[PDB]
């Protein structure tokens, strides 16, 4: 047996869930910031 790439997600163990949760956290934060920036740009561009 050998090691592949991205096998932590495949295994589905605790570590895989920890991946998916942490990544979702980070990109939820960034999506909130990007949505705020999009609204603010919209207001700054109506003018």
């Amino acid at each position: 047996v050998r090691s592949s790439a991205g096998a932590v997600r495949d295994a589905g163990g605790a570590f895989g869930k920890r991946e998916q949760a942490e990544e979702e956290r980070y990109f939820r934060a960034r999506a909130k910031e990007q949505l705020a920036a999009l609204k603010k740009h919209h207001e700054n561009e109506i003018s």
């Binding site: 096998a7 990544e23 980070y26 999506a31 949505l35 999009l38 609204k39 919209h42």
Partner: protein, 469 residues
């Protein structure tokens, strides 16, 4: 000739003859049955005995019944009259509208086109699905496979392909359902009738359904594939026209053979499959082909037992397809639908010469970025994502955006998702993925791309999320 049944064991009936002996593959009619029972010969055991597989339940058979050799293999009606009907494995209709009155009969067993009869042209077949068109483009006249576990999207995807292509097709079509739910067969029949593809009143139907659903004894599930294949063979050769042939499932064609094998007196192979798995499948998959005198755009759903692509059955089928779109359960768990696995679906026309330089560069870029993301997830396991460098957080963000953008809402999935089905022409997909890769959308949230058609719709959805924020 006329023999007499001598033994019945499961679906395997041994019949003894005193006149001449019926060659293998012949069809023998059992005398004294309320409904036509046809036994297909499969062996000559010596002493003028033949082993046979019963195409229909062998309940109520008695040792000594009389059996008449029809004299030729299972013959089925063909012609443009079978369009809009539904047929047994043995050709008799099962939609309760009277007999299929044709001039042409065809034997379901026939040799495959010789090597001197094959075509060598390949032209992409736009399907309107982003992932399929981008990473594993289909081809007109080619054989196509949908490898799925259970409940991943094989049937919804093949219904989407029917709706898309069969409706916009100049030629005819055929849907041979081999050993899958009868609920689905009825659903498809009614969907076609209500969508105009089938027409009960007049002769304007473009589909010739054939059904061997999973309540048929194994002798029947192992042959309805050949029956649908015979109808498509006729439309390819005699009509001299393009044809479509959807098969769902093509695993059951192997499973049924495995079911009867042991009783046929054969030592089992690797995983309980019959020793003749490879050839019993080649002799079938070698008739589903384009030739100089026609063209068949066969699509086939393929069960992958327990999501094990190394199983003998899918492993053997992989070599008989010009394009495979491996649906995956892991992607379907993320909610991406269709679940097509971008790093496992391949094709034979994915070349810079056949699809063009830019299409090829974009497809390879998508694959490479997704693979890089797969590698990075391992590090994100331990570090967390705040620790990732700034050239990789970009890679992860872009890869997530591309994963979402590969999803799409189909017109046959409105019942589940509620959204509206979309078709994305090839240019829209290539342009959208070019832009996502280039970085022209780092300012939109990833969820902006989830279940949208062209890229402009992702922009509009991002704007709507921002406004409603």
């Amino acid at each position: 000739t006329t023999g007499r049944i001598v033994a019945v064991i499961g679906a395997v009936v041994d019949v003894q003859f005193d006149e001449g002996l019926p060659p293998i593959l012949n069809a023998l009619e059992v005398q004294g049955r309320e409904t036509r029972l046809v036994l297909e010969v499969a062996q000559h055991l010596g002493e003028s005995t033949v082993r046979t597989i019963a195409m229909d339940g062998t309940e109520g058979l008695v040792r000594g019944q009389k059996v008449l050799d029809s004299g030729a293999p299972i013959r089925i009606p063909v012609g443009p009259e079978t369009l809009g009907r539904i047929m047994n494995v043995i050709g008799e209709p099962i939609d309760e509208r009277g007999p299929i009155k044709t001039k042409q009969f065809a034997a379901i067993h026939a040799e495959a086109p010789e090597f001197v009869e094959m075509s060598v042209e390949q032209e992409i077949l736009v399907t309107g699905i982003k992932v399929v068109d981008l990473l594993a483009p289909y081809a007109k006249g080619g054989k196509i496979g949908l490898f799925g576990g259970a409940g991943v999207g094989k049937t919804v995807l093949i219904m989407e392909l029917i709706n898309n292509v069969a409706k916009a097709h100049g030629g005819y079509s055929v849907f041979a359902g081999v050993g899958e739910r009868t609920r689905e067969g009825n659903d498809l029949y009614h969907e076609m009738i209500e969508s105009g593809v089938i027409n009960l009143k007049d002769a304007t139907s473009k589909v010739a359904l054939v059904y061997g659903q999973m309540n048929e004894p194994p002798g029947a599930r192992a042959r309805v594939a050949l029956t649908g294949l015979t109808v498509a063979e006729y439309f390819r050769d005699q009509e001299g026209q393009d044809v479509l042939l959807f098969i769902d499932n093509i695993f059951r064609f192997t499973q049924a053979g495995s079911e009867v094998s042991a009783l046929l007196g054969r030592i089992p192979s690797a995983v309980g499959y019959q020793p003749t798995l490879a050839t019993d499948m080649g002799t079938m998959q070698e008739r589903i082909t384009t030739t100089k005198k026609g063209s068949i755009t066969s699509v086939q759903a393929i069960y992958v037992p327990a999501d094990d692509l190394t199983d003998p059955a899918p492993a053997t089928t992989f070599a008989h397809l010009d394009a495979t779109t491996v649906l995956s359960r892991a992607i379907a768990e993320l909610g991406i639908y269709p679940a097509v696995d971008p790093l496992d679906s391949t094709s034979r026309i994915m070349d810079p010469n056949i699809v063009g330089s830019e299409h090829y560069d974009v497809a390879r870029g998508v694959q490479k970025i997704l693979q890089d993301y797969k590698s990075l997830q391992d590090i994100i396991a331990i570090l967390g994502m705040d620790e990732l460098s700034e050239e990789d957080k970009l890679t992860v963000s872009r890869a997530r955006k591309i994963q979402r953008f590969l999803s799409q809402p189909f017109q046959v999935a409105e019942v589940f998702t509620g959204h509206l089905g979309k078709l994305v022409p090839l240019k829209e997909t290539i342009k959208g993925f070019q832009q996502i890769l280039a970085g022209e959308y780092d300012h939109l949230p990833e969820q902006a791309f989830y279940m949208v058609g062209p890229i402009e719709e992702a922009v509009a959805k991002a704007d709507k999320l921002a406004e409603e924020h």
